Write a protein that binds this ligand. Sequence first.
Ligand code: HEM
Ligand code: HEM
Lengths: 153, 153
Amino acid sequence: GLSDGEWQQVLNVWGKVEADIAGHGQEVLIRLFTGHPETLEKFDKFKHLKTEAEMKASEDLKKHGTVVLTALGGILKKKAAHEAELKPLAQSHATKHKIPIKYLEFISDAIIHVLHSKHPGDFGADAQGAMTKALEEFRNDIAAKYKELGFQG
Amino acid sequence: GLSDGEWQQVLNVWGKVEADIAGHGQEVLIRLFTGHPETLEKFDKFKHLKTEAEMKASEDLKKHGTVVLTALGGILKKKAAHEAELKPLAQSHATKHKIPIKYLEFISDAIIHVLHSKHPGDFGADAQGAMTKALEEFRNDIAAKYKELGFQG
Ligand code: HEM
Ligand code: HEM
C-alpha cells in the first residue's frame, strides 16, 4: 500500500491532469498505441486510425482519453480514501494491540449475531450474506497490511 | 467482491446501527466477551468484568463499542465507494474488451511518461515512484477481479 506521503504525491500530480484531462488522455493513448501497436487492435472503433497523424486528428480518440483518465482518477481517489481509514487501524491492531485474525473473525461473528438479533425483519438471509462477505473482505484487507508490517496475525 | 445490491444492504443496515450506535456497540462487545472470554484478556480496562450485567453497566465498555463501530462503518463506506468504481471497470475489461494485465502495464508506463514530460516540477523521482506503486496496486486490484471472473488476464 501507499503511505499518506506517497498518496499526496499521486493526488498532487493528478490535480495537473484534471486541468486538461482531454489533452493528457489523448497523449497517453497515442503514446500507448505508437509504443505497443497490438493495443490499438483491441479498439474496433479505432480501426480507421492508421498513422500518428490520423490518431492526433481523431475526435473520438481524444474523447476516449478523457473517459479513461476520468475513470482512473476516480479509482485512485477512492483507493486513497479507503487506505486513509484502513491503514491506521491495521497499524495499531498489529503493533500495539497485537489482535490475531482469529479474534477479528470472532468480532465479525458477534456483529452478525447482534444485527440478526436487533433487525430480524430487515437483516434477512441475503443481507446477512452481504455483511458476512463485507466483514470477510475487511479481515482480508487487515491481513494484507499485517503481512506488510511483518505482524503474524 | 460484493454485488451492487449487496453493498447497498450493508450500507442500509449500518444506517440502523448508527441510529443507536451505543446500544449496538455494547451488545457486540458483550457477545464477543461472553462467547470468547479469551478476547476480554486484551482489554486491561475491562478484563475484571465477569457478567453481562457488569459489562452493561460499564461506561468505558459502552464508549469503546461506539469507537469500534464508528471506525468499521467508515471503512465499510470507503470500501463500498472504491468497489462501485473498480468493479464495473474490471467486469467490462475482462468480459467485453478482454484486456490482458500486460496491456494495463503498457498504459501505466504511458501515463508515467506523459506526467514526467508535462509536469517535471511535480513529478520528480519520489513522485514517479509513488505513481508507479499506485498504478501497480490498481493493476493488482483488477487482476484480483479477473481471477474471481475466471478471466486469465
Ligand atoms: C488505466 C487503464 C484503463 C482505464 C481506467 C480504462 C477505462 C475505460 C472506460 C471507463 C471505458 C468505458 C466503459 C467501460 O467499458 O468499462 C473503457 C472502454 C474500453 N477500454 Fe479501457 N481502460 C483502461 C485500459 C485499457 C486498455 C489498456 C485497453 C486496450 C489495450 C482498453 C480497452 C478498452 C476498450 C476496447 C474499450 C471499449 C471502447 C469502445 O468501443 O467504446 N482499456 N475503458
Ligand atoms: C471490527 C473490528 C475492530 C475495529 C473496527 C476496531 C477498532 C478500534 C479502534 C478505532 C480503536 C481505538 C484506536 C486504535 O487504537 O486503533 C481500537 C482499540 C483497541 N482494540 Fe480494536 N477494533 C476491532 C477489533 C478488535 C478486537 C477483535 C480486539 C481484541 C480481541 C481489539 C482490541 C483493541 C484494544 C485492546 C484496543 C485498545 C483499547 C484501549 O486501550 O482503550 N480490537 N479498536
